[PDB]
Design a binder for this molecule. Structure first.
Ligand SMILES: CCCCCCCCCCCCCCCCCC(=O)OC[C@H](COP(=O)([O-])OCC[N+](C)(C)C)OC(=O)CCCCCCCCCCCCCCCCC
Ligand SMILES: CCCCCCCCCCCCCCCCCC(=O)OC[C@H](COP(=O)([O-])OCC[N+](C)(C)C)OC(=O)CCCCCCCCCCCCCCCCC
Ligand SMILES: CCCCCCCCCCCCCCCCCC(=O)OC[C@H](COP(=O)([O-])OCC[N+](C)(C)C)OC(=O)CCCCCCCCCCCCCCCCC
Ligand SMILES: CCCCCCCCCCCCCCCCCC(=O)OC[C@H](COP(=O)([O-])OCC[N+](C)(C)C)OC(=O)CCCCCCCCCCCCCCCCC
Ligand SMILES: CCCCCCCCCCCCCCCCCC(=O)OC[C@H](COP(=O)([O-])OCC[N+](C)(C)C)OC(=O)CCCCCCCCCCCCCCCCC
Ligand SMILES: CC(C)CCC[C@@H](C)[C@H]1CC[C@H]2[C@@H]3CC=C4C[C@@H](O)CC[C@]4(C)[C@H]3CC[C@]12C
Ligand SMILES: CC(C)CCC[C@@H](C)[C@H]1CC[C@H]2[C@@H]3CC=C4C[C@@H](O)CC[C@]4(C)[C@H]3CC[C@]12C
Ligand SMILES: CC(C)CCC[C@@H](C)[C@H]1CC[C@H]2[C@@H]3CC=C4C[C@@H](O)CC[C@]4(C)[C@H]3CC[C@]12C
Ligand SMILES: Nc1ncnc2c1ncn2[C@@H]1O[C@H](COP(=O)(O)OP(=O)(O)O)[C@@H](O)[C@H]1O
Ligand SMILES: CC(=O)N[C@@H]1[C@@H](O)[C@H](O)[C@@H](CO)O[C@H]1O
Ligand code: ALF
Ligand SMILES: [Mg+2]
Ligand SMILES: [Mg+2]
Ligand code: NA
Ligand code: NA
Ligand code: NA
Ligand code: NA
Lengths: 994, 303, 34
């Protein structure tokens, strides 16, 4: 069941009109297009091809979401019962306290400050992230006035004719005038992503079912089509749908899942204590109203309100950093995932390479030939007149399909802008500069049929009419993977004369590829066949879906190789990447020779490791004789991956340090990825072409080249390097590693405080001593040390070890693990607690009550009526008189925690290095330290603080009581981290490296 | 890689499962031990530091005097009948209704019996009239256990008796007994003619610290009671010869000055609030501490 | 001023408020460092 009935309601089309009819309707010539005039005219009439902006949310409403954001909402709950309990106090007593009045005030205040803070940050992300929504001007290819040009899709009007190819996004609703084996992706419309074919045929009375309508917002997977624009902008079937053509979507990142899991359990225990303490307090003769306020204070205390805001800042930070690096990231959480990468499977052509090729050598007549590679000023280094070169360059031109764009024939050949394969571009530009006009050559040999090139066939092919006299009337021409091409041939062309492909030439063809390909040049094979007349009459009906003509027994003409150098950054890119423990695997549909070469040149493979072929060739023994494990690197032809079991593929992945997968199919690019994932890794695919689509989707993170990348591949990815800068991947990986550390650091720090925030009341019962710390003071601990300092850690700069340490194991280094509970609770949380206890005993003993005396007093110290409370010196204390000291003890215990929280907030700044390497360059941390203590001075030394919150001034000696303990933390962790710097794999590390 | 790590496990039985090696969802007896020990030494030594640093502070307070007194600064006025909620309510005719008030007040006065102040080494005789501060000396172990200024049950007029087992105390019209709070090294100062009292300065400006029990505050109040102060020398307050106090270390059996107030009113069957007040220069009061230098007992002789 | 026994909280209070002022102000001065 669907709603497709509620979509075909408002339809009405011309998928039924004949071509002549279609012509006279829109008025455009079905082959020459519309004049640029008539285009500009209709554009001002109809307005740009762009859906009109759908308002998602308003400002103030987004403010409120933030204000009630998860933790924020519970804060209101407590803040409500704080005002609520204060209302009740003015009904049970005459002029009661001011505690719960001020408590609701502060609590609520926190939600507000937190709220409007987090808002503003999250607003800043959606400012910067949206500054990129309009940086990729989706282009469209239109044939206006005979020639063809690529313009902004916004400039496409009703009427003109569009040409989509493989991986092109369909720019507006089209009626297909023409297509060779075109397949579109109707997923966005009809669910199933299976490629539906578009022919020009009218197939179904319903515009949706029919094959000759290509829709706006779908994209054509592969094949090629020319359509005519029948719906622009909001008028298209996909603009008509008032849902969400572009904006809000789905997916739930692992980092998000880790956080959400933690928050579910931390909030769990935090409410387990609250109510266990709530009933315990009740048992311990706590008043009814101050029991719920004890609970509500406990809950706030074991719940890390900062986390959210911290996360928000961290994203806002990362989104600002990627932005300055021209790296469009569709989901900010995913940058985390890009840190957790163990394995980058990269594409070769247009990714590691510049995709800017230039023809450098040809192989024909058993000889290798050079052609002027840069600043040519001439043509090649052979006679332009050679019969063979003639037959080569004819098909390099004929089987080519690339063309110069509009209004270019007036400037130099290198200076003009093209349209099609970077390979074809080079072929075009080559022969246009040294031989003739491909424009004229192609028009002389009017092309009857073709199967356009695709990443899986790895050859193009076309049958052209021949206008010569030694013309057998039809000329087949084809090009592709030189190996593949050669294997389809019977004869070879030599000095004009074709003569059978003996063994000798085959091996000269093979040294040629080794030679030429070994320079890291890209190679294409070229052959033709002169279709015999008696078998192919004049009006012959060439079929191209059942192959009416020979695909075998062709005449190999030659090889042409083009230079295609590695993109500037790529070496140090993959350098730094491996150095961070990330495994780089090349995955290419190119030839093994060409691949390995680049693999060594960029450093996927290091010259010193051998392949089994390398080893075998060294000892002059059979390759199939070498033991595969003696090889650290290997170059795996996809023709053999076809005969791999998963185990076999698994094993090559498992036991090889430097892998390269050559001549791989699109799917194979997925299998490999699928393999690398099966091992338990997190993979990154960097693509460009549309053959990268399926891997890029399967990958834990897709990364498209923002320029040379296709529509469909950029759409698959989670990252689009707009400057095509491959180095951005490192900048990304570091950033991602940093989100993870700083988010773990924050959780380490915020969790310490819990132990001391709850140990007092636990001991109050276990030793029956005066309460060292109470509700009012617990809140201060929390909202004073566990807030700003926690968020400060988000602003904390990178460590120094990140791009030098192995990628995190997703099933070990969880954002919160047992080792992190070990420290915040069992180690650093304990010490801090002892700091408070110490000062507590010091104050009482100094005020007359030696610790040993303190056992048992609870019942009667808390008792409102016994005013003969005899200390150790025998002195007699009244109720309020000893309470003054008790609550002075509270104010100190709190202040103590503040002192130890410095050291903790210092050690929780670095997880490996020392704090002298790291250095105080996080100014927001320093800021956090000062205000945190200024506040702590203030709460104790401000008048009426003991009448309003039971907080009384400290005597100078008190502050230092916690100092020994604070230092103890700094140094325990300092040496703890030092043992790890100098004992990797060592017991220290394997237990205390949270 | 060839390195074997991670958790590619497929048994939730591993919660306890061990057939392989590791057990209890933990590691092996080698590390289940080793880490247990780490904490053992850690906490063990950690507790050592708390102990240690606690010990350092201990030798910064003399076991003779508190390092701070300003929080017991002015003392408070306290009675001996355990006050339920400051209230002494009973049915005068019925013995059961006050038997609680009696046992508490009787238990305390057993520290003051004549049979308890036997020996002349521990107990010294301060005169039968209130004198000036008998200053034992300097708050040290120099002179040993200082002498205890004795106090006879007889001075508390009419609230002493001499029965058999339990003291025969006041059933018709009760006996409240007032006491001062032991502040180590304190010397009470009786008021002069400037800052006078809510009542005419009963004699003994020199050596008696006055205590006067009026009705509920001083303003418009239902004043219905018959006060009768009983004490040493027949004076309504405290004999200055008992101070200063030298601590539990130096005066283990120190008996403090007592001073009763048998309340023999003319109004049964109702509850009346009565505020006592010890006046002086060394005595302060507080609007929050209802016990600092003063007193708010509300009693009901509802028969 | 002085007299029998007590603790001068006037200066301990004004002293700590001078300090709260330092930490507060210096705290801002770092977070706004030009
Ligand atoms: C009884 C208990 C009482 C305790 C109450 C404590 C209240 C704390 C409540 C939550 C505070 C959360 C704030 C997160 C930290 C933001 C850091 C940041 O760099 O901000 C700039 C960022 C700007 O973007 P940015 O971070 O990219 O730019 C930073 C550039 N420099 C380095 C120059 C600053 O955002 C803000 O502008 C938002 C404003 C929010 C500030 C909150 C102030 C806290 C108020 C009181 C706390 C105590 C100290 C008193 C001093 C007040 C003056 C500051
Ligand atoms: C009136 C009430 C009494 C008041 C007193 C209050 C005292 C309570 C103190 C705290 C108790 C809270 C327990 C800790 C919570 C940890 C849960 C967690 O998320 O771990 C999951 C994780 C699960 O991780 P996992 O999901 O990845 O699973 C891993 C396993 N494989 C790989 C096979 C999938 O568990 C652990 O691995 C950790 C083991 C811990 C060892 C023992 C745990 C429990 C023992 C102590 C609790 C005692 C109960 C006290 C209550 C008494 C009430 C009367
Ligand atoms: C009256 C008694 C008072 C006692 C006070 C005790 C206070 C201690 C509080 C509990 C600490 C646990 C905090 C939970 C935080 C959760 C964080 C999270 O993200 O979880 C994921 C993490 C996941 O980490 P992980 O991924 O590494 O775990 C799985 C990995 N393997 C398979 C290797 C196990 O889970 C945790 O680590 C949970 C911690 C459990 C530790 C056990 C603590 C014991 C509790 C205290 C003593 C019990 C007493 C019993 C006797 C009762 C009699 C009175
Ligand atoms: C490798 C790195 C190491 C660092 C280099 C070595 C530095 C020198 C070593 C120690 C320094 C001095 C401190 C130790 C003394 C112990 C104090 C004591 O016994 O406490 C109990 C005493 C108790 O003495 P009491 O027994 O008479 O008790 C009564 C005192 N009152 C009434 C005040 C309670 O406590 C104090 O009175 C001390 C508090 C005073 C207030 C301020 C103290 C700050 C001074 C420290 C400065 C450190 C020097 C550096 C300069 C800093 C400039 C920015
Ligand atoms: C009253 C006591 C006050 C004590 C205050 C002093 C601060 C420190 C207190 C505890 C001692 C622990 C400090 C060790 C930190 C490790 C630094 C390190 O990695 O070095 C290489 C770093 C990094 O060099 P790197 O950048 O070339 O990288 C090398 C990294 N390793 C060598 C680990 C492979 O060098 C430095 O940056 C120099 C700064 C560190 C020097 C320490 C300053 C003072 C600390 C020691 C004084 C205390 C005496 C010791 C006794 C303690 C017991 C009371
Ligand atoms: C209030 C006081 C009494 C609470 C004391 C809680 C102590 C006993 C708790 C707090 C944190 C705990 C540790 C937290 C994490 C781990 C890692 C686990 O693999 C072994 C147990 C161990 C080491 C725990 C032992 C007990 C532990 C140390
Ligand atoms: C290098 C190492 C060993 C130095 C060790 C110094 C320890 C012993 C010092 C550092 C700070 C000290 C404390 C500082 C302040 C006070 C308050 C005072 O009223 C009692 C003593 C007490 C509690 C101190 C005891 C000793 C102390 C803990
Ligand atoms: C190394 C760094 C972290 C040490 C920080 C030392 C800070 C904690 C110390 C140094 C001097 C201290 C002050 C010294 C004297 C007084 C007067 C007293 O009436 C109030 C506290 C107050 C104001 C103290 C607060 C804390 C204090 C400011
Ligand atoms: N336009 C084209 N016409 C014919 N053959 C081509 C064309 N482009 C590439 N080829 C050949 O087919 C192979 C497959 O290319 P593909 O599968 O996309 O990988 P890559 O883009 O890395 O070459 C190429 O190595 C090349 O030899
Ligand atoms: C029952 C009883 O003994 N009442 C006595 C009374 O005899 C005595 O005259 C008076 C002197 O204060 O004290 C009271
Ligand atoms: F650029 Al490729 F296969 F290397 F598409
Ligand atoms: Mg590609
Ligand atoms: Mg390609
Ligand atoms: Na909290
Ligand atoms: Na994915
Ligand atoms: Na903390
Ligand atoms: Na906390």
């Amino acid at each position: 069941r669907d709603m497709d009935e509620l979509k075909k309601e408002v339809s009405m089309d011309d998928h039924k009109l004949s071509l002549d009819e279609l012509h006279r309707k829109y008025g455009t010539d079905l082959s020459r297009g519309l004049t640029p005039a008539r285009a500009a005219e209709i554009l001002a009439r109809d307005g740009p091809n762009a859906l009109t902006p759908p308002p998602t949310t308003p400002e103030w409403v987004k403010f409120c979401r933030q204000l009630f954001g998860g933790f924020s909402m519970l804060l209101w709950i407590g803040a409500i019962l704080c005002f609520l309990a204060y209302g009740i106090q003015a009904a049970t007593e005459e002029e009661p306290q001011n505690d719960n009045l001020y408590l609701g005030v502060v609590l609520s205040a926190v939600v507000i400050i937190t709220g409007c803070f987090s808002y503003y940050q999250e607003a800043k992300s959606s400012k910067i992230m949206e500054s990129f929504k309009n940086m990729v001007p989706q282009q469209a290819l239109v044939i206006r006035n005979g020639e063809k040009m690529s313009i902004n899709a916004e400039e496409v009007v009703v009427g003109d004719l569009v040409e989509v190819k493989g991986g092109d996004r369909i720019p507006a609703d089209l009626r297909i005038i023409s297509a060779n084996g075109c397949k579109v992706d109707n997923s966005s419309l009809t669910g199933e992503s299976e490629p539906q074919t578009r022919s020009p045929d009218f197939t179904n009375e319903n515009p949706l079912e029919t094959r000759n309508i290509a829709f706006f917002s779908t994209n054509c997977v592969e094949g090629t089509a020319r359509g005519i624009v029948v719906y622009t902008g909001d008028r298209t079937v996909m603009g008509r749908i008032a849902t969400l053509a572009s904006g809000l979507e789905g997916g739930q990142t692992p980092i998000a899942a880790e956080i959400e899991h933690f928050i579910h359990i931390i909030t769990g225990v935090a409410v387990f204590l609250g109510v266990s303490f709530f009933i315990l307090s009740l048992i311990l003769e706590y008043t009814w109203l101050e029991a719920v306020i004890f609970l509500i204070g406990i809950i706030v205390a074991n719940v890390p309100e900062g986390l959210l805001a911290t996360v928000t800042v961290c994203l806002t930070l990362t989104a600002k950093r990627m932005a300055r690096k021209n790296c469009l990231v569709k989901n900010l959480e995913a940058v985390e995932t890009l840190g957790s990468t163990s394995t980058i499977c990269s594409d070769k052509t247009g990714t590691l390479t510049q995709n800017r090729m230039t023809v450098a050598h040809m192989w024909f007549d058993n000889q290798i030939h050079e052609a002027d590679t840069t600043e040519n000023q001439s043509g090649v280094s052979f006679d332009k007149t050679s019969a063979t070169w003639l037959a080569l360059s004819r098909i390099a031109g004929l089987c080519n399909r690339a063309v110069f764009q509009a209004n270019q024939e007036n400037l130099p050949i290198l200076k003009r802008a093209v349209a099609g394969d970077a390979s074809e571009s080079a072929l075009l530009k080559c022969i246009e500069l040294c031989c003739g006009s491909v424009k004229e050559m192609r028009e002389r040999y009017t092309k009857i049929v073709e199967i356009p090139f695709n990443s899986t066939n790895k050859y193009q092919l076309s049958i052209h009419k021949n206008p010569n006299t030694a013309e057998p009337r039809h000329l087949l021409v084809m090009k592709g993977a030189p190996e593949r091409i050669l294997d389809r041939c019977s004869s070879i062309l030599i000095h004009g004369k074709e003569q059978p492909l003996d063994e000798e030439l085959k091996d000269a063809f093979q040294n040629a590829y080794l030679e030429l390909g070994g320079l890291g040049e890209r190679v294409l094979g070229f052959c033709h066949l002169f279709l015999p007349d008696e078998q192919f009459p004049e009006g012959f009906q060439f079929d191209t879906d059942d192959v009416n003509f020979p695909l075998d027994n062709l005449c190999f003409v030659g090889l042409i190789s083009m230079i295609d150098p590695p993109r500037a950054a790529v070496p140090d890119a993959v350098g730094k990447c491996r150095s961070a423990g990330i495994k780089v695997i090349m995955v290419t549909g190119d030839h093994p020779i060409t691949a390995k070469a680049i693999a060594k040149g960029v450093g996927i493979i290091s010259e010193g490791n051998e392949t089994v072929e390398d080893i075998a060739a060294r000892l002059n023994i059979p390759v199939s004789q070498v033991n595969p494990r003696d090889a650290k690197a290997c170059v795996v032809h996809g023709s053999d991956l076809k005969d791999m079991t998963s185990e076999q593929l698994d094993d090559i992945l498992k036991y090889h340090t430097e892998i390269v997968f050559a001549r791989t199919s699109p799917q194979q690019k997925l299998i490999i990825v699928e393999g690398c994932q099966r091992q338990g890794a997190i993979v990154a695919v960097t693509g460009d072409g549309v053959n990268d689509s399926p891997a890029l989707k399967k990958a834990d993170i897709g990364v498209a080249m923002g320029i040379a990348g296709s529509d469909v591949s950029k759409q698959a990815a989670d990252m689009i390097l707009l400057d095509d800068n491959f180095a951005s991947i490192v900048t990304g990986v570091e950033e991602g590693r940093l989100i993870f550390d700083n988010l773990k650091k924050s959780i380490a720090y915020t969790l310490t405080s819990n132990i001391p925030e709850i140990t007092p009341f636990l001991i109050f019962i276990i030793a029956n001593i005066p309460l060292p710390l109470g509700t009012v003071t617990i809140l201060c601990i929390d909202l004073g040390t566990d807030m700003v300092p926690a968020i400060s850690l988000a602003y904390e700069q990178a460590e120094s070890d990140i791009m030098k340490r192995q990628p995190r194991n997703p099933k070990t280094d969880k954002l919160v693990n047992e080792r992190l509970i070990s420290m915040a609770y069992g180690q650093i949380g304990m010490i801090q607690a002892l700091g408070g206890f110490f000062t507590y005993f010091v104050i009482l003993a100094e005020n007359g009550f030696l610790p040993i005396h303190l056992l048992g007093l609870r019942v009667n110290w808390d008792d409102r009526w016994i005013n003969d409370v005899e200390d150790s010196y025998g002195q007699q204390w009244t109720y309020e008189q000893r309470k003054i000291v008790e609550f002075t003890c509270h104010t100190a215990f709190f202040v103590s925690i503040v002192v130890v929280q410095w050291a903790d907030l210092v050690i929780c700044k670095t997880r490996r290095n020392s704090v002298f390497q790291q250095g105080m360059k996080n100014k927001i941390l320093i800021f956090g330290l000062f205000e945190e203590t200024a506040l702590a001075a203030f709460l104790s030394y401000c008048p009426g603080m003991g009448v309003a919150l039971r907080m009384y001034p400290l005597k100078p000696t008190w502050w230092f009581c916690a100092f020994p303990y604070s230092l103890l933390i700094f140094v325990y962790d300092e040496v703890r981290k030092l043992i790890i710097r100098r004992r990797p794999g060592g017991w220290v590390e394997k237990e205390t490296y949270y | 890689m060839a390195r074997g790590k991670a958790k590619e496990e497929g048994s939730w039985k591993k919660f306890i499962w061990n057939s392989e090696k590791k057990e209890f969802l933990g590691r092996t007896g080698g590390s289940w031990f080793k880490i247990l020990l780490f904490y053992v030494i850690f906490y063990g030594c950690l507790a050592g530091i708390f102990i240690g640093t606690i010990q350092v502070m201990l030798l910064t307070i003399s076991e003779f005097k508190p390092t701070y007194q300003d929080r017991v600064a002015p003392p408070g006025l306290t009675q001996i009948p355990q006050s339920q909620k400051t209230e002494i309510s009973f049915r005068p005719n019925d013995p059961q209704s006050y038997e609680s008030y009696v046992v508490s007040i009787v238990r305390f006065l057993e520290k003051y019996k004549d049979l308890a102040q036997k020996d002349d080494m521990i107990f010294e005789d301060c005169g039968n009239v209130p004198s000036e501060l008998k200053e034992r000396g300097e708050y040290n172990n120099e002179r040993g256990e200082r002498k205890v200024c004795r106090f006879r049950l007889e001075w508390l007029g009419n609230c002493s008796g001499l029965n058999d087992e339990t003291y025969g105390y006041k059933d018709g019209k009760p006996c409240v007994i007032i006491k001062l709070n032991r502040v180590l090294g304190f010397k009470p100062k009786p008021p002069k003619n400037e800052s006078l009292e809510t009542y005419p300065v009963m004699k003994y400006n020199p050596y008696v610290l006055p205590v006067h029990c009026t009705g509920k505050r001083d303003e418009d109040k239902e004043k219905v009671g018959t006060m009768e102060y009983f004490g040493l020398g027949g004076y309504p307050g405290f004999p200055l010869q008992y101070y200063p106090y030298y601590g539990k270390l130096l005066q283990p059996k120190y008996l403090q000055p007592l001073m009763a107030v048998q309340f023999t009113n003319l109004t049964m069957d109702t509850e009346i609030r009565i505020e006592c007040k010890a006046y002086g220069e060394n005595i302060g009061y507080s609007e929050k501490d209802r016990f600092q230098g003063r007193f708010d007992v509300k009693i009901e002789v509802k028969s | 001023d002085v007299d029998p026994f007590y603790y001068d909280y006037e200066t301990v209070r004004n002293g700590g408020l001078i300090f709260a002022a330092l930490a507060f102000i210096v705290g801002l001065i770092i977070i706004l460092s030009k």
